[PDB]
């Protein structure tokens, strides 16, 4: 509904890390929410954006889009400020239709969640080896 | 690793609704590994496909793609066989770098899972409330 701080704990690899996201305001040109972590430098921090197609009279079909990115930076020699070395993206796009009931929409979201913890995707993402 | 019969339990809007996925073989042309459900009709069954980028000596980016799509169909009047009326899609595309370590990929994957279970995105998907 109304976005506020989002706290994630015991996140992965070894459960040693935590992540607190603070709301960063809804973009008014295309309705994209934003969240970010309180980092040292604004140019390098973990960001999340959630976009939901607005309700209208008819619409073709709805869309939910989540898009995260985590930049890793290093202090290069001969420079005084960190520069973003690289970053890993990720995004998920749901494409429900007009007549989709609540139960089946809530089935896809937690089927994806329960599948990202299965051994198959653990091996497919952590070590990057196909099936 | 070698794909097996993935069973997902305790999923869907509440409580328990198991879902046993059986492997459907790799596609040689593009390398997508398919999974499916033991349905009575082959065209009325949920399926998921994973696709990890093939490791090469000079590949300066990797890309994992998981694509769930499940149909729901009612017995159309005037015919003896059911026909697909609508279906729900969901695809996620990770995009790492040639130099990304395991601590980054595991972080991204578990962050996405915890966000899928977050109290914001659950309502943004179930009730389609914009944030």
């Amino acid at each position, epitope marked *: 509904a109304k976005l506020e701080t989002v706290t994630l*704990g015991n996140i992965g690899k070894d459960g040693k890390q935590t992540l607190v996201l603070n709301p960063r305001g809804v973009n008014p040109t295309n309705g994209v929410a934003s969240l970010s972590q309180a980092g040292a430098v604004p140019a390098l921090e973990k960001r999340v954006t959630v976009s939901v197609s607005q309700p209208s009279r008819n619409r073709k079909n709805y869309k939910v889009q989540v898009k995260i990115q985590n930049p890793t930076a290093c202090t290069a020699n001969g420079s005084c400020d960190p520069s973003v070395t690289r970053q890993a993206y990720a995004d998920v796009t749901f494409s429900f239709t007009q007549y989709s009931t609540d139960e089946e929409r809530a089935f896809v979201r*937690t089927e994806l969640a329960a599948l990202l913890a299965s051994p198959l995707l*653990i091996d497919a993402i952590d070590q990057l080896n196909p099936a | 690793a070698k794909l097996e019969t993935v069973t997902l*339990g305790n999923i869907g809007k509440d409580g328990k609704q198991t879902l046993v996925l059986n492997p459907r073989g790799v596609n040689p042309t593009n390398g997508v590994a398919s999974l499916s459900q033991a349905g009575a009709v082959p065209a009325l069954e949920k399926r998921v496909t994973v696709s990890v980028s093939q490791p090469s000596r000079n590949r300066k980016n990797y890309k994992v793609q998981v694509k769930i799509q499940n149909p729901t169909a009612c017995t159309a009047n005037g015919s003896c066989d059911p026909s697909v009326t609508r279906q729900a899609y969901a695809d996620v595309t990770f995009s790492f770098t040639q130099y990304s370590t395991d601590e980054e990929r595991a972080f991204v994957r578990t962050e996405l899972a915890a966000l899928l279970a977050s109290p914001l995105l659950i309502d943004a998907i179930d009730q389609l409330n914009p944030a």
Partner: antibody
Framework: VQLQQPGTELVKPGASVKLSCKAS????????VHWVKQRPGQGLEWIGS????????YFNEKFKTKATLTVDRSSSTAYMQLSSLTFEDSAVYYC????????????????WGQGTTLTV | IQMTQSPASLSVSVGETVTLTCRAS??????LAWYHQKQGISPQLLVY???KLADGVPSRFSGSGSGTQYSFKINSLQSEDFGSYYC?????????FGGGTKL
């Protein structure tokens, strides 16, 4: 739903017996299993924990080089090693299930089984 | 993150409400447990989020907490509520438990 784990075990210092905890009534491969160590007159410790499926292990720093734990899906059992035992190890070892295999919010131990009361 | 609990003994006879706190060191958010054990048997869960009753325990235990300071209280002490209540945090990995306060 019930977790059972003998009553008593005795080793002598140097040896290393593996504690077992059998869980019945809740479809074992869906909830992670946690191990907690209680001294006879002090507080709890939380040795470590794993979940039955995908076998990810969460360890305490102190017990990383002393205990390893595994699962047996066929018999639905959880095993814990304690690879080396000294004199200051006689305690009570509880196995409790808490959580679920795909969420990182609920991890509260709710269904503790009885102890073992190791003696060295 | 190390949790430091508050008075361990608290004495108190069975005629009054009792209130205790379990401080946190580095602002754990509202996710901690309130285990209870009677000596000789395994512990039991009472409050499983901060203010939520766990399964069926009677609604005479109540918890509440700030960003970094949480409290647990009982309305009628009754004869059974003894045995060094414990608190545990689930923010990081260590899940260090608390000191434990007898009654």
């Amino acid at each position: 739903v019930q977790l059972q784990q003998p009553g008593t075990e005795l080793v002598k210092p140097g040896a290393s017996v593996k504690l077992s905890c059998k869980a019945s009534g809740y479809t074992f491969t869906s909830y992670s299993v946690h191990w907690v160590k209680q001294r006879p007159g002090q507080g709890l410790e939380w040795i470590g924990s794993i979940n039955p499926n995908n076998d990810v292990a969460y360890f305490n720093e102190k017990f990383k080089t002393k205990a390893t734990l595994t699962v047996d899906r066929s018999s639905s059992t959880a095993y814990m090693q304690l690879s080396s035992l000294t004199f200051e190890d006689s305690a009570v070892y509880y196995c409790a299930r808490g959580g679920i295999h795909y969420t990182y919010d609920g991890y509260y131990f709710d269904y503790w089984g009885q102890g073992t009361t190791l003696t060295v | 993150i190390q949790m430091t609990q508050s008075p361990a003994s608290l004495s108190v006879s069975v005629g009054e409400t009792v209130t205790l706190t379990c401080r946190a060191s580095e602002n754990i958010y509202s996710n901690l447990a309130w285990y209870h054990q009677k000596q000789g048997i395994s512990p039991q869960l009472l409050v499983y989020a901060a203010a939520k009753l766990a399964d069926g325990v009677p609604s005479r235990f109540s918890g509440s907490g700030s960003g970094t300071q949480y409290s647990f209280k009982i309305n009628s002490l009754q004869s059974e509520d003894f045995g060094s209540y414990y608190c545990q945090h689930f923010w990081g990995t260590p899940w260090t438990f608390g000191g434990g306060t007898k009654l």
